[PDB]
Amino acid sequence: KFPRVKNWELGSITYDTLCAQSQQDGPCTPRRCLGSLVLPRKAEQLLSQARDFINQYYSSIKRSGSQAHEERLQEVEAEVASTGTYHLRESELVFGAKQAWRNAPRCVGRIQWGKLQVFDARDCSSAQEMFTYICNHIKYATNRGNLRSAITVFPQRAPGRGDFRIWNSQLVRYAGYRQQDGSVRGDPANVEITELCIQHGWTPGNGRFDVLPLLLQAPDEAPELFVLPPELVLEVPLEHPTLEWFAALGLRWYALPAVSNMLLEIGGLEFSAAPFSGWYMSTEIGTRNLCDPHRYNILEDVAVCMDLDTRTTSSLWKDKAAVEINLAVLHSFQLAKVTIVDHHAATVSFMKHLDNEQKARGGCPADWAWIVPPISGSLTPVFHQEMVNYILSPAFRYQPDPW
């Protein structure tokens, strides 16, 4: 029937009835679970999604059945029947953006979901205008290190017309230059975007942390290249509270995590450019970005500096170096007065969020493999909590690369 959901540390049980509201298939079947896969393998419809969303909106303002609610439904209907599409009012877009964050199964930061600044950028007609909105978004969100969550929404997709797109996967990305002796200098995750930039006329650097320009694209136009003003990109030098040699590693990370390659779907409408930002959880930087073998891969370097036995796995040299790197990220962001949350505090807030949502909506869609942090899993409460994963709309979705 409905999933019985148990927490194995406390022995407490809930039941998810929210999943019954899902209208979209995930990748699992009774024959086999594909829950660990990162990406998906691959007018009456629009109208029914539209109506459902308008229903969500009016219920949320506690005015279901009001004349305003009936009129709005007819507007949507008349617009679709005539034009094949429709448009949201700003207040609907604001509600929609918040629900999409709220519904995002892979996000451990959802306790913050109702606090989101929404910039309406739907009156955008050029890449140059896109750039101006983006600079303002960054300036607002960064806020001298007192980070504020925000989203900017660019014009929706229209049939038989190219999309508005930001080609970069994030607003801030460090270059990855592939030197022909096999290796990569910089961030291996951004090799393809770096090359795309150079090809579109960017003068490349040759450092480990060169901030990339943005490639911005208006419909059916070649993308345009814009360099972000260095004073807009707040960055944090990494040092360690006790290990003085750590700063000599020349490591740093940027303050603002702003994803810019995802599609925002609201009521059947699709926003192909809608970058969103919040603040970092430390493990993203300290564990994944710096310690992944296919990223900066600094584990061995830090270990050799800590004079650890690199010869055998059984000395746990990797685990020790990783802890210290995460410590340095936390220490450095704290010294710089830049908002950051550690994985213990984040997962503790998520448990509170699960409980809030259980009372509010009867469940919470969550992807266990993503919610549990990449170091010290079972040391956090979420490890011991069963979760149900399913797709609710409004939603953030992946979409193909524009190139």
Next chain:
Amino acid sequence: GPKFPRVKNWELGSITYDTLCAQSQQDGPCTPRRCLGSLVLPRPAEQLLSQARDFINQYYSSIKRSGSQAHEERLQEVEAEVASTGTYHLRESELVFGAKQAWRNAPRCVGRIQWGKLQVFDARDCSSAQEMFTYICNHIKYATNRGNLRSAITVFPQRAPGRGDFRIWNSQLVRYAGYRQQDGSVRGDPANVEITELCIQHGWTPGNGRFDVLPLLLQAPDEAPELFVLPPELVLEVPLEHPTLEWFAALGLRWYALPAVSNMLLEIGGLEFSAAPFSGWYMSTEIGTRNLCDPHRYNILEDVAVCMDLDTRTTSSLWKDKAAVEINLAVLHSFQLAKVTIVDHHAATVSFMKHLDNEQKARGGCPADWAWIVPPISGSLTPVFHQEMVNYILSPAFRYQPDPW
């Protein structure tokens, strides 16, 4: 592309397709509408015969005699036996193949690289609780081997029509007592509170330590379980010390050498073996992270962090992470010093990636439960974190079964 799940490793960029999942004949808990992958326990002769035939086919394939005269004859013999008695019996070599294949098929086990080297003790002649005990002690002595641990399974008689099961009530052959206290706390292992109280109900005189080895409650068919004390010399333990933190030894922590699971059901060709205890050797995180640091287990994290003089008043000091690493190191160092087989989570996961490649070639895939395969500390520092996995049920299988009481 091919019409099978596509499986990617995000570290290496390499891609495989799982075709083995096509052979699954039993559903798990997921649907296209919602994934239940994270749940720990998810919820007639014609039915027996098809399970039986499938297994005999599997057996004859494994010896490259599929379609042979002996194959058709063994099939014919299984149908005849089921037809006249409602059940059938496995030849010795079929039981051995079945036991190894159940291990090979176990989605939650990271140690499967070793699957082909499993010593199978045939105990289907056992007729008493006392005899079960003799078999179990023999298993323990062989598997323990003075610290040079050897994988083994002992198989007691199958479930039979209208007759009680053979059962071992304890969840493992070695378990530390958990004594419920007057204030509500637990002395010992909280995981074992219930089995401890059952032992006392059945006549065990209880100790009062943190590490009292429990007696075994053993049940022969249609009889009350009998109580058996393991002679201490048979139960190898390892006192825990740390290679540099000299005070760690003073904590008086220890763990037993042999992980031997005893409450699972071994299913083969529809036959059900309700008592089939199996053992290997530990991965160090099972002891160092889960058993010692889980909040609902021994919960020693704060004790150790205080000894290490860490800031336990704030999450951002990473005092939990720091203490947990040193505890795992102590586990590894103590087992190594004691010459008792053990594998760290890095070596174990590397060996499992090797296993995945072997099985891709041998069977076109490998059923695996990501959440269980990725270790409870240092997750993304191990190669399995970045490997997509397909989970599904194959038979022969080890299955959960309800508690006997």
